[PDB]
Design an enzyme around this catalytic site. Structure first.
Site, mmCIF file in Angstrom:
data_model
loop_
_atom_site.group_PDB
_atom_site.id
_atom_site.type_symbol
_atom_site.label_atom_id
_atom_site.label_comp_id
_atom_site.label_asym_id
_atom_site.label_seq_id
_atom_site.Cartn_x
_atom_site.Cartn_y
_atom_site.Cartn_z
ATOM 1 N N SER A 1 -22.315 28.942 14.551
ATOM 2 C CA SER A 1 -20.965 28.586 14.085
ATOM 3 C C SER A 1 -20.326 29.841 13.501
ATOM 4 O O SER A 1 -20.143 30.808 14.260
ATOM 5 C CB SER A 1 -21.055 27.368 13.163
ATOM 6 O OG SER A 1 -19.766 26.778 13.007
ATOM 7 N N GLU B 1 -19.962 19.004 19.997
ATOM 8 C CA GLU B 1 -19.581 19.878 18.889
ATOM 9 C C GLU B 1 -18.584 19.228 17.932
ATOM 10 O O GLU B 1 -18.621 19.484 16.722
ATOM 11 C CB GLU B 1 -18.963 21.177 19.424
ATOM 12 C CG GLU B 1 -19.918 22.022 20.287
ATOM 13 C CD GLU B 1 -20.934 22.794 19.454
ATOM 14 O OE1 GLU B 1 -21.045 22.561 18.230
ATOM 15 O OE2 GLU B 1 -21.615 23.663 20.031
ATOM 16 N N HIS C 1 -22.766 19.402 16.242
ATOM 17 C CA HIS C 1 -22.671 20.769 15.739
ATOM 18 C C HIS C 1 -23.735 21.044 14.686
ATOM 19 O O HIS C 1 -23.836 20.319 13.692
ATOM 20 C CB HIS C 1 -21.278 20.973 15.147
ATOM 21 C CG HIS C 1 -20.963 22.389 14.769
ATOM 22 N ND1 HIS C 1 -20.826 23.396 15.703
ATOM 23 C CD2 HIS C 1 -20.689 22.952 13.567
ATOM 24 C CE1 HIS C 1 -20.502 24.523 15.088
ATOM 25 N NE2 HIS C 1 -20.404 24.279 13.792
HETATM 26 C C1 LIG Z 1 -16.774 23.227 0.856
HETATM 27 C C2 LIG Z 1 -17.720 22.373 1.682
HETATM 28 C C3 LIG Z 1 -17.470 22.510 3.218
HETATM 29 C C4 LIG Z 1 -16.035 23.036 3.577
HETATM 30 N N1 LIG Z 1 -15.192 22.147 4.544
HETATM 31 C C5 LIG Z 1 -15.416 22.499 6.038
HETATM 32 C C6 LIG Z 1 -15.938 23.994 6.234
HETATM 33 C C7 LIG Z 1 -16.699 24.293 7.528
HETATM 34 C C8 LIG Z 1 -18.118 24.087 7.691
HETATM 35 N N2 LIG Z 1 -18.411 24.436 9.002
HETATM 36 C C9 LIG Z 1 -17.290 24.856 9.710
HETATM 37 C C10 LIG Z 1 -17.162 25.313 11.083
HETATM 38 C C11 LIG Z 1 -15.841 25.685 11.508
HETATM 39 C C12 LIG Z 1 -14.735 25.595 10.624
HETATM 40 C C13 LIG Z 1 -14.897 25.151 9.256
HETATM 41 C C14 LIG Z 1 -16.225 24.784 8.833
HETATM 42 C C15 LIG Z 1 -16.425 21.464 6.631
HETATM 43 O O1 LIG Z 1 -17.504 21.286 5.967
HETATM 44 N N3 LIG Z 1 -16.300 20.706 7.818
HETATM 45 C C16 LIG Z 1 -17.368 19.789 8.248
HETATM 46 C C17 LIG Z 1 -18.652 20.596 8.641
HETATM 47 C C18 LIG Z 1 -19.808 19.796 9.302
HETATM 48 C C19 LIG Z 1 -20.780 19.265 8.208
HETATM 49 C C20 LIG Z 1 -21.527 17.940 8.569
HETATM 50 C C21 LIG Z 1 -22.610 18.043 9.675
HETATM 51 C C22 LIG Z 1 -22.870 19.515 10.162
HETATM 52 C C23 LIG Z 1 -21.745 20.087 11.046
HETATM 53 C C24 LIG Z 1 -20.574 20.757 10.271
#
Ligand SMILES: CCCC[NH2+][C@@H](Cc1c[nH]c2ccccc12)C(=O)NCCC1CCCCCC1
Ligand SMILES: *[C@@H]1O[C@H](CO[C@@H]2O[C@@H](C)[C@@H](O)[C@@H](O)[C@@H]2O)[C@@H](O[C@@H]2O[C@H](CO)[C@@H](O)[C@H](O)[C@H]2NC(C)=O)[C@H](O)[C@H]1NC(C)=O
Ligand SMILES: *[C@@H]1O[C@H](CO[C@@H]2O[C@@H](C)[C@@H](O)[C@@H](O)[C@@H]2O)[C@@H](O[C@@H]2O[C@H](CO)[C@@H](O)[C@H](O)[C@H]2NC(C)=O)[C@H](O)[C@H]1NC(C)=O
Ligand SMILES: *[C@@H]1O[C@H](CO[C@@H]2O[C@@H](C)[C@@H](O)[C@@H](O)[C@@H]2O)[C@@H](O)[C@H](O)[C@H]1NC(C)=O
Ligand SMILES: *[C@@H]1O[C@H](CO)[C@@H](O)[C@H](O)[C@H]1NC(C)=O
Ligand SMILES: *[C@@H]1O[C@H](CO)[C@@H](O)[C@H](O)[C@H]1NC(C)=O
Ligand SMILES: *[C@@H]1O[C@H](CO)[C@@H](O)[C@H](O)[C@H]1NC(C)=O
Length: 526
Positions: free
Chosen positions: A195, A322, A435
């Site tokens: 990622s 994804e 993802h």
């Molecule tokens: C401040 C805490 C997280 C901050 N918000 C965003 C930041 C971010 C995390 N991965 C990213 C990839 C591309 C762009 C932005 C992000 C966020 O978590 N989205 C959900 C991520 C999921 C989690 C659940 C299962 C796992 C898969 C990924």
């Protein structure tokens, strides 16, 4: 147990793995702690120490906001930091085979997390299985994230941008100077990441300062040309200025803004990060890489198009679903705790969530291209369309376009499509092959039979681990011993790729051909 590095001695610890031993050095410092006047600056070199540094526990994770969307739920909390947060976080880890190897190939992991989160100490990044099974050395580093890692006033050395990428780079330099003492070959170093870590890997291919620090590159579910991966200088300044106003640090001297931000406590900076944009999405990258004129000399799309990157082999791939993880972070009608059958109108509202600054025509064009159903009456039509929209736009089509453009300049590229859903996945089945959920297979966690994976999963992880190691050692991700499907090179004409699953490994062509023509050729116009 004790290794002499160029900055001092470090003591490791012995681990029992699969009836053998691995020596782990957890938490070696590789830079001056970026505290006080060093906050927001590029990392500074380390001053020597004469003690024996005890590298026997993971170090602090960098300061970051935590995912609190599902407290108590393993599927989200497995990604949260598992060591104390601190600005004092520039440390790395080294796993080496036992007995000490003579000239081992080195794999350097760069974690993801949207450039806003992440740490090298997560359970799914434990390098001890790769060291044990493939006799490689595994290195991983913590790098600064969020505004502490990527705040930018372009040109201003007090906050130049890309500091977290320079953290990564300084750790690459540490490996070049020190890994031979651990039995590693500094001339055989492969970067791998997922990622935002894969986007980082792709930017090291672009950065002249990183070109002598590694040999080959692996990109799991990310690349710099993904729409979330690079912040414009216009966006970057607007966001730095908004942070200043939200913290009471607005000044006319831009340097005085930074000095005021240097006196705020880390938590005050963290609390205001989400609000520096007017419209946030589940993929918002509020502070990320920028064209700083230092790490990145030009807009990276230009560099890629015109062949200005390190000429070497690459291994790139994506997962089948994804986009689904992000749907439960804001799309209406979605929940991890039901089957999230949504309506047409919910789909349309979901596009507003994921594409807030896009014209009505732009959003209609997405709907037009993704809602031509094979059967208008399948209830999950809209649920599945929104996940594919989010995944194709943000991960799959950028990865394929990166691989095409990189391969056009003459290097061997290998592309995979990972389509196995972990038997232990805590998320619901409608989210599919999510993802991040190939990582545990790459790191060999299913090789531990005590941990409830199936036998088919043990065999899949064993083959992936061998292919990744053969790529790092030899530039060629084959499994040569067990009558395996041969992995062909990806060329821009035929576009062959390898599917990874427990049943049948297959060679396919032109992944997502119709969808990516929409995202790559049309959608950038709207
Ligand atoms: C401040 C805490 C997280 C901050 N918000 C965003 C930041 C971010 C995390 N991965 C990213 C990839 C591309 C762009 C932005 C992000 C966020 O978590 N989205 C959900 C991520 C999921 C989690 C659940 C299962 C796992 C898969 C990924
Ligand atoms: C650039 O920044 C301005 C200012 O953002 C506002 O103030 C910040 C401190 C933070 O609190 C943000 O959430 C605020 O939105 C943005 O201008 C605002 O835009 C929104 C909608 O576009 C509007 O409702 C507000 O009235 C605007 N505020 C001001 C003071 O003009 C702007 O949208 C940002 N983005 C770009 C691309 O310029
Ligand atoms: C699936 O659940 C979502 C989310 O609702 C929450 O989670 C549920 C499991 C349950 O605990 C609810 O009480 C929670 O509110 C549902 O989305 C909600 O739908 C209702 C009616 O359509 C609406 O009042 C809420 O605004 C919705 N929440 C949103 C949009 O965030 C959804 O309806 C459920 N779908 C199915 C097929 O059961
Ligand atoms: C570094 O560690 C030395 C030895 O520690 C040994 O290993 C750890 C894991 C413990 O089990 C400990 O009981 C062992 O003796 C110490 O002698 C030394 O003081 C440590 N250095 C510092 C600065 O703490
Ligand atoms: C390790 O291999 C490199 C070539 O990849 C070689 O130049 C170097 O001398 C070797 N070092 C050893 C065997 O210690
Ligand atoms: C204020 O800005 C000037 C340039 O405009 C700069 O030289 C000076 O260092 C800044 N003030 C401080 C205290 O650094
Ligand atoms: C090859 O197959 C054997 C079983 O015959 C298995 O034990 C071994 O782990 C396999 N090797 C790889 C690299 O998959």
């Amino acid at each position: 147990i004790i290794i002499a590095t160029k900055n001092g001695k470090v003591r490791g610890m012995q681990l029992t793995v699969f009836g053998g031993t691995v020596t782990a050095f957890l938490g070696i410092p590789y830079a001056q702690p970026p505290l006080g006047r060093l906050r927001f600056k590029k990392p500074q070199s380390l001053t020597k120490w004469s003690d024996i540094w005890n590298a026997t526990k993971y170090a602090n994770s960098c300061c970051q906001n935590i995912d609190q969307s599902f407290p108590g739920f393993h599927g989200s909390e497995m990604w949260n930091p598992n060591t104390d947060l601190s600005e004092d976080c520039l440390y790395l880890n080294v796993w080496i085979p036992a007995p000490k190897p003579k000239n081992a190939t080195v794999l350097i992991w760069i974690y993801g997390g949207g450039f806003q989160t992440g740490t090298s100490s997560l359970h799914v990044y434990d390098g001890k299985f790769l060291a044990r099974v493939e006799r490689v050395i595994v290195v991983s580093m913590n790098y600064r994230v969020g505004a502490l890692g990527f705040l930018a006033l372009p040109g201003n050395p007090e906050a130049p941008g890309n500091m977290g990428l320079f953290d990564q780079q300084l750790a690459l330099q540490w490996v070049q100077k020190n890994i031979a003492a651990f039995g590693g070959n500094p001339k055989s170093v492969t970067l791998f990441g997922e990622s935002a870590g894969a986007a980082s890997v792709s930017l090291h291919l672009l950065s002249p300062g990183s070109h002598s620090l590694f040999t080959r590159a692996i990109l799991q579910s990310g690349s710099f040309n993904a729409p979330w991966a690079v912040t414009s200088l216009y966006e970057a300044r607007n966001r730095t200025l908004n942070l200043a106003k939200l913290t009471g640090c607005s000044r006319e001297n831009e340097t005085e803004i930074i000095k005021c931000l240097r006196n705020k406590d880390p938590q005050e900076i963290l609390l205001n990060e989400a609000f520096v944009v007017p419209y946030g999405t589940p993929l918002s990258v509020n502070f990320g890489p920028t064209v700083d004129g230092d790490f990145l000399t030009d807009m990276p799309d230009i560099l890629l198009e015109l062949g200005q990157f390190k000429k070497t082999q690459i291994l790139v791939g994506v997962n089948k679903d994804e986009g689904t993880a992000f749907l439960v972070y804001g799309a209406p009608g979605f929940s991890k705790d039901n089957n999230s059958i949504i309506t047409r109108k919910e789909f349309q509202e979901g596009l507003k969530i994921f594409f807030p600054g896009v014209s009505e025509f732009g959003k209609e064009s997405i709907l037009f291209h993704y809602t031509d159903w094979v059967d208008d009456q399948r209830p999950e039509n809209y649920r599945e369309a929104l996940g594919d929209v989010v995944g194709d736009y943000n991960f799959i089509c950028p990865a394929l376009e990166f691989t095409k453009k990189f391969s056009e300049w003459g290097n061997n590229a290998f592309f995979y499509y990972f389509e196995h859903r972990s038997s232990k996945l805590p998320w619901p089945e409608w989210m599919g092959v999510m993802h991040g959920y190939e990582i545990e297979f790459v790191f060999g966690l299913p090789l531990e039979r005590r941990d409830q994976y199936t036998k088919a999963e043990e065999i899949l992880s064993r083959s992936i681990v061998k292919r990744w190691a053969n790529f790092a050692k030899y530039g060629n991700p084959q499994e040569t011993q067990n009558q395996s499907t041969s992995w062909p090179v990806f060329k821009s004409t035929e576009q062959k790729y390898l599917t990874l699953n427990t049943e049948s490994t297959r060679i396919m062509t032109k992944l997502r051909a119709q969808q990516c023509r929409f995202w790559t050729s049309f959608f950038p116009k709207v």
